[PDB]
Design a binder for this molecule. Sequence first.
Ligand SMILES: [Ca+2]
Ligand SMILES: [Mg+2]
Lengths: 120, 120
Amino acid sequence: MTISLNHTIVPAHNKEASAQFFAQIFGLNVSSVGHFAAVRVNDTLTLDFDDRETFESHHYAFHVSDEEFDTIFARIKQAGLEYSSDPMHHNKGEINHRKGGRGFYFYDPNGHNLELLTLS
Amino acid sequence: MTISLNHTIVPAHNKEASAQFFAQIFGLNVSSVGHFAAVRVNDTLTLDFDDRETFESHHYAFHVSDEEFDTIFARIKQAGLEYSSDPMHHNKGEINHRKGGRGFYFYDPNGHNLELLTLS
Ligand SMILES: [Ca+2]
Ligand SMILES: [Mg+2]
């Protein structure tokens, strides 16, 4: 039938801090699974945070509902985090309106580029 | 629920060779999209292959049907690629039978660790 992404490993300097950051902002939960701090995103995907000393910035873009967009964006502002309309973060403190939707980018504690969008 | 991963950037020394490798083995298509060689995996997810000189190994685990598993595994053997039952590739030329399913690991041309699983 269908190929689906089930797991991906997210490298982190501190896997618990990174998993907690992600779970707090997205309204999800952290589980200790083997050597990972695992965050189940939905009924098909889990992000496995893994302790790593050296790695480059990843880029993850998430489709969310309008309600989820508003809820997550409020948590980012409440947490005192910077965000941008553009992937390079040249345009801070604003969102994009690409494809008749809403979008923005924000870095995780490792410098991974997280992207939220309402229309895919 | 309504958070889904829509895009992720896969770093590659050669984005066209890497996107073609992934598309050939998984039975997918490559599109040129901006500076990416993009592979739509399913209705939800696109892998964006991006030219990069320096990066660390990523890990992506895909859930597939038994039929898809067999079709992909046969392409991997026909292509002359090594695979393993374990994530560290200590046990080559065998698959695992974990979680009431079948699984195996194989590297892409960049050394990204690709995992296939049927689960249940
Ligand atoms: Ca998903
Ligand atoms: Mg998927």
